[PDB]
From a paper:
The nuclear retinoid X receptor (RXR) is a unique family of ligand-activated transcription factors, which in humans comprises of three members, namely, RXRα (NR2B1), RXRβ (NR2B2) and RXRγ (NR2B3). All three RXR isoforms typically function as a universal heterodimer partner for other nuclear receptors, including the type II thyroid hormone receptors (THRs, NR1A1-2) and the peroxisome proliferator-activated receptors (PPARs, NR1C1-3). Here, we report a complete set of the crystal structures for all three RXR isoforms in active, ligand-bound conformation with an identical ligand. In addition, we discovered saturated fatty acids, including palmitic acid (PA), myristic acid (MA) and stearic acid (SA), as RXR modulators capable of inducing the recruitment of co-regulators to the RXR ligand-binding domain (LBD) and hence, activating the receptor.
Upon crystallization and structure determination of the recombinant RXRα LBD in complex with the glucocorticoid receptor interacting protein 1 (GRIP-1) co-regulator peptide, we unexpectedly observed extra electron density within the ligand-binding pocket of the protein. Based on the shape of the density, we hypothesized the presence of a fatty acid, likely contaminated from the recombinant protein production in Escherichia coli. Mass spectrometric analysis further confirmed the identity of this ligand as palmitic acid (PA), a widely abundant fatty acid in bacteria and eukaryotic cells, which was successfully modelled in the crystal structure. A structural comparison with other known RXRα ligands, such as JP175 (compound 24), revealed that PA occupied the orthosteric binding pocket typically targeted by other small molecule modulators and the accommodation of this fatty acid did not require any structural alterations (see Section 2.3). The carboxylic acid moiety of the fatty acid formed a salt-bridge contact with the highly conserved Arg316 (using the numbering of RXRα as an example), a canonical interaction typically observed for most RXR ligands. The saturated hydrocarbon tail was seen to elongate along the hydrophobic groove until C11-C12 where an ~90° bend was formed to ascend the rest of the tail toward the hydrophobic pocket created by Phe346 and Leu324. In comparison with RXR synthetic small molecule modulators, such as JP175 (compound 24), this L-shape conformation allowed the fatty acid to fully occupy the vast hydrophobic space of the ligand-binding pocket without the need for structural rearrangement of the lining residues. Thus, this RXRα-PA-GRIP-1 tertiary complex opens the possibility of involvement of fatty acids in RXR signaling. We observed indeed that all three saturated fatty acids promoted SRC-1 recruitment to RXRα, with an increase in their efficacies seemingly corresponding to longer chain lengths (EC50 of 3.2 µM for MA, 6.6 µM for PA and 19 µM for SA).
Residue numbers in the entry:
A (entry chain B), D (entry chain B): 471 to 482
B (entry chain A), C (entry chain A): 225 to 252, 262 to 458
């Protein structure tokens, strides 16, 4: 899952 | 040679980039609620910190996720502990709140609070641990090759080795009169691990009892893999 | 200089003095019962080991007690882990019994058993950790200045520093081609701490449920201070 | 308390 963490890691 | 593939300058820059701007602290109903609000706030900042550590952003996304889920609690504890060397019987939260020893004891979390002060804050203060050293210890924690599910544990091991080679060189150059300093830094990591485990046990209890607000990112970190 | 007040020769002699004499291992109803019987046996041997570590016997009796009560579980885990580098999917107990991965999983302790194999045994094997290095890591664990209630934590800190100064010198002399080796040894201590905490949680559960025999010395170590 | 551990540490 880890929705928030994936979103924050993507955003460059 | 150490410094070139993992420069301590970049690790210090990561620390300095994410420092909170608090002019004057004030004492925190429930300090545990304030600590949990600060932890949620600082998880957003932790992701920004990790992106600034050399080579972290080049790992596979799934491995970045595993390392931050494995490390966040120790990473946050190391940060607030180092921030707190400035006060005598308390901790400084990133929200600009202070939690006094007495407040922590009065909230039923005295024993773990005392471990943080005695094993981390006081020891960081006694040796004047600097922000480069803190950053390097945090980067060692982040690059944890024992984290379950990594696609390539050997590449994380290699990044950890580059950090500790760079930290040792930094310590020998800056503190040549203290030949034991590098070992003394590394030997705070078992205490950090133990204190992180106990803090996570508390947080799971706070979630279970349901009497402590837990915001969305902190809640996500408490979810099963 | 390091070596003279805390000689690695004496720490190796302590290791070699207490090694079990097992010619041929055999597979262990309940492997957990066999592990608990071996732990009780080895607590007697641990006291003899600690007496042979330079300066330990010169500490106040109450501080000797605090250090062994704080350290025993990590000390025993480090020992059986190093003993087990000789086998591929198991651990070798001091009683001459082997516990296979499959036996541990079949007894409901698979997850912790796998952590021991992956984070300790396999890593000790991969780097060919030697008995001098093992002895020094164990002496660092024994001389734990964070142990609560010590009469003079600074003297225990000083003994720890003498061990790690001696270990570093030993590593530089014997393994000069591996400049990272000393750090790599120290960086097993957080995993050892975590695995020790989880093993102690298991042992408290085994005591609570009451379905696992726990002999007198192991029982005494599970008593409140 | 720690009866066994005290006994084993004394005996020299
Ligand atoms: C410090 C005593 C712990 C009290 C109860 C356990 C809760 C665990 C919280 C640990 C993470 C705290 C993060 C603070 C973030 C910060 O302000 O820098
Ligand atoms: C190894 C998996 C653990 C299973 C359940 C937890 C029990 C904790 C026991 C840890 C101490 C074991 C000591 C063995 C002594 C030895 O033979 O050398
Ligand atoms: Cl230490
Ligand atoms: Cl490591």
């Amino acid at each position: 899952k880890h929705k928030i963490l994936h979103r924050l890691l993507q955003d460059s | 040679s150490a410094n070139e593939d993992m420069p301590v300058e970049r690790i210090l820059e990561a620390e300095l980039a994410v420092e909170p701007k608090t002019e004057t602290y004030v004492e925190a109903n429930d300090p545990v609620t304030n600590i949990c609000q600060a932890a949620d706030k600082q998880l957003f900042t932790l992701v920004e910190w990790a992106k600034r550590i050399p080579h972290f952003s080049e790992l596979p996304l799934d491995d970045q996720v595993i390392l931050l889920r494995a490390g966040w609690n120790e990473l946050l504890i190391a940060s607030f502990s180092h921030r707190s060397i400035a006060v005598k019987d308390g901790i400084l939260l990133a929200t600009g709140l202070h939690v006094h020893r007495n407040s922590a004891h009065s909230a039923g979390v005295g024993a773990i609070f005392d471990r943080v002060l005695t094993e981390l804050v006081s020891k960081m203060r006694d040796m004047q641990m600097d922000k480069t050293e803190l950053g390097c210890l945090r980067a060692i924690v982040l690059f944890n090759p024992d984290s379950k599910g990594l696609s390539n544990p050997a590449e994380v091991e290699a990044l950890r080795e580059k950090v500790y080679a760079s930290l040792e060189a930094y310590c020998k150059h800056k503190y040549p009169e203290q030949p034991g300093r590098f070992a003394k830094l590394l030997l705070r990591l078992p205490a950090l691990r133990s204190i992180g485990l106990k803090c996570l046990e508390h947080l799971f209890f706070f979630k279970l009892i349901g009497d402590t607000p837990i915001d969305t990112f902190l809640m996500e970190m408490l979810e099963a893999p």
